[PDB]
Design a protein around this ligand. Sequence first.
Ligand SMILES: CC(C)NCCCn1c(Cc2cc3c(cc2I)OCO3)nc2c(N)nc(F)nc21
Length: 209
Amino acid sequence: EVETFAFQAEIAQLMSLIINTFYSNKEIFLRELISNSSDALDKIRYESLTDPSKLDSGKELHINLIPNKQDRTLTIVDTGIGMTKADLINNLGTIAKSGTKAFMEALQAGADISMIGQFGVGFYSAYLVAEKVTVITKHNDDEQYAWESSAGGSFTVRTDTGEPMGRGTKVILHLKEDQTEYLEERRIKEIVKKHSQFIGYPITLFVEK
Ligand SMILES: CC(C)NCCCn1c(Cc2cc3c(cc2I)OCO3)nc2c(N)nc(F)nc21
């Protein structure tokens, strides 16, 4: 049962801008995704302080970076708070609409794509290097979902019957043919050290094979 939705015009426009604008500093996508994971981890930790049972789905708070050359994917995994179906289909888009407007106005004023995170829409920077993005997420008290989009103005959502993850989010980046450098251990280590060296959670970079 796969449902297809249309991105709001503003988000579709943002994605097209990210995909079409000539901008060489693409590596910043990783920092934005790790930052999103860190925020999600901060939230579940905060909520667990008043309701310890929210960690029954997993006490470990961390981030895993998993590259796979055979599938040509780079997956950013976290055990943060996770997203509900409502987040994926309506709420995150509602919030992203205003962030997108501010970002594009900032761009015409002289800002550049690397500052996308200051507008709450850094997630979409994933399209700087991925032709398709698959997001698997599980929030307590909601089912595990699989969100997916190759841009083009639409995305899909389905209940994920794959391997249960407990709680958290996995952003699976199906890399563009000319962006496989982000599957190399050397490259990922360099980027994490450069832009995400102070994240307050363990970041484990898995090795290939
Ligand atoms: C309340 C706050 C935590 N929401 C953050 C924005 C959504 N967000 C995002 C950013 C985001 C993710 C999307 C998305 C829109 C956005 I913005 O479309 C489907 O996947 N990343 C995560 C993440 N790793 N974990 C959790 F819990 N939330 C994610």
